[PDB]
Amino acid sequence: VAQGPNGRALAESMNPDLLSAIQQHISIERYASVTYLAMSIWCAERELAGFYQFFDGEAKDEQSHAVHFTQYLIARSQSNDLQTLDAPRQNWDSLASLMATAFQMEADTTSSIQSVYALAERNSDTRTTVFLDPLIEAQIQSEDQFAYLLGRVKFANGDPTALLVIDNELRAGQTQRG
């Protein structure tokens, strides 16, 4: 039985370019996590408690996604390589602008997964494409959700009264079209 780069018994070798791309995607997820934390803080600074609670949960969720990817590398007997994590963006002129960055961060996370997926297909790594399938499905619902929040905030058109109403929705757990 062969041993993988992390020392465990190796079911099938992984191409180093695919390994590198998974390790980088873990950084993308970790960066989304600290970005949602930064957004949580911005909302708390403006007394938007519902948005603060929503992004606090999202930061924890993105971190769970990152850890889920580190477990896949363990399961494949590959080495992890936790990287330097850049500082998040921390300043926005409005909630609409924040939510725009939020949506783009979700969409960018999906693009990263898609890039890993395409490289797995090139390498015929069916374990990885299967592993990624439910994660792409969750990204579809997250994109749908962030499009909903962004659009609802844009509909408010900067009226504080409407932003308070939406804030209370989020505090209540009303965060999707349903």
Residue 62 known to bind ligand: yes
Residue 30 lies near Fe ion (rule: CB under 5 A) = no
Which of Fe ion, its own copies, none does residue 104 bind to, with CB < 5 to 8 Å depending on kind?
Answer: its own copies
Q: Using the rule CB under 8 A, which residue among 86, 94, 122, 173 binds its own copies?
A: 86
Tokens 């939020």 sit at which residue? 102
In the complex, the smallest distance separating the C-beta of residue 32 from its own copies, rounded to whole angstroms, is: 13
DSSP codes, the chain: --B-TTSSB-SS---HHHHHHHHHHHHHHHHHHHHHHHHHHHHHHTT-HHHHHHHHHHHHHHHHHHHHHHHHHHHTTPPP-----PPPP---SSHHHHHHHHHHHHHHHHHHHHHHHHHHHHTT-HHHHHHHHHHHHHHHHHHHHHHHHHHHHHHHTT-HHHHHHHHHHHHTT--S--
Site for its own copies in 12-71 (CB under 8 A): 12, 34, 37-38, 41, 44-47, 49, 52-53, 56, 63, 67, 70-71
Cα separation, 82 vs 150, in Å, equals 32
68 labelled binding-site residue:
no
User: Does the footprint of its own copies cover residue 173 (CB under 8 A)?
Assistant: no
Nearer Cβ to its own copies (20/176)? 176
Q: Which is nearer to Fe ion, 23 or 109 (CB)?
A: 109
**Least distance to its own copies from the beta carbon of 143, Å?**
4
- Residue number with CB closer to Fe ion (137 or 159): 137
Cα(27)–Cα(21) distance, rounded to whole angstroms? 10
Q: Which residues in 137-156 contact its own copies (CB under 8 A)? A: 137, 139-141, 143-144, 146-148, 150-152, 155-156
Q: Which residues are annotated binding-site positions for Fe(3+)?
A: 29, 62, 65, 106, 133
